[PDB]
């Protein structure tokens, strides 16, 4: 039953001046160090959640303000912190430097520049833990978040302000879907933020380079917490991403924040809680592993018009194990978000990329977010895929009745060939509308399966030089053009297209 503050020289300096009054200090000395978690006697004017600075220069967050010691969590490399180092308190509660001058930089969860392009001149700080927008602070999601992926923008559409989980196994294309929906925001007024949690530094470097190639760093901010970084920096990367997005949200700008593998944050918080000897629960995650992600993702709102109208749309990622959507962390994050995009593994092995299982991918709030043309076009798209998948699940061989022989199977094969994309090439929404129109109305029933991709590739170049009236109509009025002219345009391309 030993208490940690029972240190011999410390007891000696306590019976230095017991009854004689001693003015209390705002510095403290470390008692214990280990596993990125320290304790310090002293610091009685510290407050809960304050940034404290070690003599090394490493920051720290004071979690537990116990009776004679302060439980400090070391935010950085802790191998230079010894017992006896003095801890100095700053006076701020978990602030990251946030500004307009942070756009295009790659930072750690404490707002320090990691890419090595010099300092970041910001004048304003934002707290990491802050209350979410309340029930009267919000507004219903009505603005489209255009990803440029046809399967997302048609089947599971994202609104500006909703939280949609992107879920799937390892090597199923979650990061590519993120970088595609970040590269597509170049024309829009979206400020993207990519938060990489527990990834390899090599892949984060290639991610940042493919963002720099497509001009995406004019609006995106990369918050990097590596796999080699300690769990206190992994735990704070999404909160730093949200705190950097809220500056632009509460000024009226629209922010997209992407969390690559929140399962890594949950595992690092399991680490940070078990090293604090908090008793674990199901799958050894702590009791507040739900509250870990709910304090994060409920802070992503569509604000009302009384508060400026800004929005934080969040795309968190959860990595399953063998396609298990009924695990503990996937079902914790499903019941926080407004939908899921289930990137299935064997559809990714068979070649369907993006490999969206459209049966299990739902968008709750989306559907009021489609652009009034994608509604008309995709409402007859979704059931073709649904019927096609659950009848190719059994009808592999044997002759079938002519409806279920061709008008289901061949139409579904044309849907699958329509919805495939190559990565880092986002399609604008009007060309998605016209291709899925030419699919669903029946203009791809003549063209064989192997030519749908080249039909789409040449049809886009056809549209860019002839159908500017169609594309400008879908830009301005957001509705489908009059179907006589549009059928005339598609038949005018089918007269030109050379079938192979």
């Amino acid at each position: 039953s030993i208490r940690a503050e029972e240190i011999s020289a410390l007891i000696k300096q306590q019976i230095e001046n017991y009854e004689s009054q001693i003015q209390v200090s705002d510095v403290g000395t470390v008692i214990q160090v280990g596993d990125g978690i320290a304790r310090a006697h002293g610091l009685d004017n510290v407050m809960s959640g304050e940034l404290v600075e070690f003599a090394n220069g490493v920051m720290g967050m004071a979690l537990n303000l116990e009776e004679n010691n302060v439980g400090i969590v070391i935010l950085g490399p802790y191998t230079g912190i010894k017992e006896g180092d003095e801890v100095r308190r700053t006076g701020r509660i978990m602030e990251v430097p946030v500004g307009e001058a942070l756009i295009g930089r790659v930072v750690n969860p404490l707002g320090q520049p990691v890419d090595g392009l010099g300092p970041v001149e910001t004048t304003e700080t934002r707290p990491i833990e802050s209350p979410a927008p309340g029930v009267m602070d919000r507004r219903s999601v009505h603005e489209p978040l255009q990803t440029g992926i046809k399967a997302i923008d048609a089947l599971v559409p994202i609104g500006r302000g909703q939280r949609e989980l992107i879920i799937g196994d390892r090597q199923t294309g979650k990061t590519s879907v993120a970088i595609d929906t970040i590269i597509n925001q170049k024309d829009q007024n979206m400020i993207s933020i990519y938060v990489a949690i527990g990834q390899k530094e090599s892949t984060v470097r290639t991610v940042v380079e493919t963002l720099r190639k497509h001009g995406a760093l004019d609006y995106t901010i990369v918050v990097t917490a590596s796999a080699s970084q300690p769990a206190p920096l992994l735990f704070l990367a999404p909160y730093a991403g949200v705190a950097m997005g809220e500056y632009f949200m509460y000024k009226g700008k629209h922010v997209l924040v992407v969390y690559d593998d929140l399962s890594k944050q949950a595992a690092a918080y399991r680490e940070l809680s078990l090293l604090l000897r908090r008793p674990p629960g199901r799958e050894a995650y702590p009791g507040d592993i739900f509250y870990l992600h709910s304090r994060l993702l409920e802070r992503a709102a569509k604000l009302s018009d009384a508060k400026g109208g800004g929005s934080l749309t969040a795309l968190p990622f959860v990595e399953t194990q063998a396609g298990d959507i009924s695990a503990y962390i996937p079902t914790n994050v499903i019941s926080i978000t407004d939908g899921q995009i289930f990137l299935q593994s064997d559809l990714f092995f068979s070649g369907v990329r993006p490999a969206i299982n459209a049966g299990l991918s739902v968008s709750r709030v989306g559907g009021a977010a489609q652009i009034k043309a994608m509604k008309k076009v995709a409402g007859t798209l979704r059931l073709d895929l649904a019927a096609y998948r659950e009848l190719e699940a059994f009808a592999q061989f044997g002759s079938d009745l002519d409806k279920a022989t061709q008008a289901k199977l061949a139409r579904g094969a044309r849907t699958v060939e329509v919805l495939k994309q190559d990565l880092h090439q986002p399609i604008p929404v009007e060309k998605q509308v016209l291709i899925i129109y030419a699919l669903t109305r029946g203009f791809l029933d003549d063209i064989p399966v192997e030519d749908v991709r080249r039909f789409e590739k040449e049809f886009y170049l056809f549209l860019d030089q002839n159908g500017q009236h169609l594309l400008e109509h879908i830009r301005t009025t957001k509705d489908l053009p009059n179907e006589d002219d549009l059928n005339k345009a598609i038949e005018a391309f089918k007269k030109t297209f050379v079938v192979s």
Partner: protein, 471 residues
């Protein structure tokens, strides 16, 4: 003139030390109002409630908001009572916080209003009322196989993303308008989005000015997510005690009550129980759950969504709440993945009101014959999985042939799910779903395709949808 210091601050949990003989009590509210003397301090307006006594004049508390900013040695003002909540018909048409304060931006409740404490003992045995009457909902699984009791507690067990918020919103859409008595929606620990959609639906559908709303949604630290169910409950207890009024009380995710208890219980000095839950998992949800009762003065008919973590019905937080509920509807992930909405397991769902002296003999034997054919098909599942349909002995083929029709005809299109799919939704009376299931079991609809029965209100619409398919 007795105040107390702060000794320890441990996340949600604060230690407070008073003078000798002036400890408040358990469950009293403690206030902190600090004024940020210098630039190294933060303004604090924080309320604490007492959970324990520890000896040496110390008090183990649970905070109701975020403790980020508390300094050791900060003074605490005692109140001398639990968290007192403004109550009455002042609460009708307003949205509230955990502390009783209004959040709906329409003004503040005056200080001279009547305030009831959150914590009180349960109603006694001599005061309770046990008359069983059926509440008609218009949902075919609920009306046939697990009827709801007008004045008893009701559960909506589901996993994550399986259909219990849609089911609770359609029960509001089918019940709360024509109810003729006070509603209370206390949302415990669900999406703050769904507190906004639901409030604007109450505004434009004109339900509100009879509904009091209490939101302690999932952004709140767990001290709020515990006591939110109790402040919504004391708002409803005013009506059924003082006014004798029939009360609806919808609680969304009463699981989050026990989860928020589990988050604080490690820091309260308690040992962990099995599965990481607090030791008092059965009595913290017995002191809440025995105050939602229909007494002799008035009746509370309460429908409670209950989350089931990791789709594990053997978890101690859903398993110890089956013993509190009169009617349950156990949603299943498999039925939602087959497209059967509501995803109600027809066999795991039970009720006190499915008995012939209450529900009628024709209703009772049609419900039991439906359950019998679905259980026989559930026994045949393995033979159908491995050997296929071709081995069954011409009565089992008929049982499968009828049970596909039954488990698809239990699915129904909702008014809430009009925004999902465009199909406008249906309301089905009890005698008509009894007649439709009797006509399915008689064999009157064996010639129709089995996909003609999905998402259909009554069986004339089965006939219409099968004609539109082209049979």
């Amino acid at each position: 003139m007795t105040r107390g210091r702060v000794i320890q601050v441990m996340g949600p949990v604060v230690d407070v030390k008073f003078e000798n003989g002036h400890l408040p009590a358990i469950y009293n509210a403690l206030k902190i109002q600090h004024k940020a003397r210098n630039e190294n301090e933060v303004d604090i307006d924080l309320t604490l409630e007492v959970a324990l006594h520890l000896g040496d004049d110390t008090v183990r508390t649970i905070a109701m908001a975020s403790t980020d900013g508390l300094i050791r040695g900060m003074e605490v003002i005692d109140t001398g009572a639990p968290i007192s909540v403004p109550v009455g018909e002042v609460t009708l048409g307003r949205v509230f916080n955990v502390l009783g304060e209004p959040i709906d931006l329409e003004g503040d409740i005056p200080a001279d209003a009547r305030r009831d404490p959150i914590h009180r003992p349960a109603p006694k045995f001599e005061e309770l009322a046990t008359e069983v009457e059926i509440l008609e909902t218009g949902i075919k699984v609920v009306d046939l196989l697990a009827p709801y009791i007008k004045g008893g507690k009701i559960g909506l067990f589901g996993g994550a993303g399986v259909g219990k918020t849609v089911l609770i919103q359609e029960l509001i859409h089918n019940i709360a308008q024509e109810h003729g008595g006070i509603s209370v929606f206390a949302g415990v620990g669900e999406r703050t989005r769904e507190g906004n959609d639901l409030y604007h639906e109450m505004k434009d559908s004109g339900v509100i000015s009879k509904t009091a709303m209490v939101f302690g949604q999932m952004n709140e630290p767990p001290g709020a997510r515990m006591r939110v169910a109790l402040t919504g409950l004391t708002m409803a207890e005013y009506f059924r005690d003082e006014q004798g009024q029939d009360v609806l009380l919808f609680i969304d995710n009463i699981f989050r009550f026990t989860q928020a208890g589990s988050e604080v219980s490690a820091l309260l000095g308690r040992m962990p129980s099995a599965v990481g839950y607090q030791p008092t998992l059965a009595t913290e949800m017995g002191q809440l759950q025995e105050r939602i009762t229909s007494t002799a003065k008035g009746s509370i008919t309460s429908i409670q969504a209950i989350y089931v973590p990791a789709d594990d019905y053997t978890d101690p937080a859903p398993a110890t709440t089956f013993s509190h509920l009169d009617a349950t509807t156990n949603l299943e992930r498999k039925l939602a993945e087959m497209g059967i909405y509501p995803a109600v397991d027809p066999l795991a769902s039970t009720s006190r009101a499915l008995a012939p002296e209450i529900v009628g003999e024709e209703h009772y034997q049609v419900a039991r014959k439906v359950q019998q054919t679905l259980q026989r098909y559930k026994e045949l599942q393995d033979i159908i999985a491995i050997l296929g349909m071709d081995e069954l002995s011409d009565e089992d083929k008929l049982v499968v042939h009828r049970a596909r029709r039954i488990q698809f005809f239990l699915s129904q299109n909702f008014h809430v799910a009009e925004q999902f799919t465009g199909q406008p939704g249906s309301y089905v009376p009890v005698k008509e779903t009894v007649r439709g299931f009797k006509e399915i079991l008689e064999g009157k609809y064996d010639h129709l395709p089995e996909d003609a029965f999905r998402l259909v209100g009554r069986i004339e619409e089965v006939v219409e949808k099968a004609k539109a398919m082209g049979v």
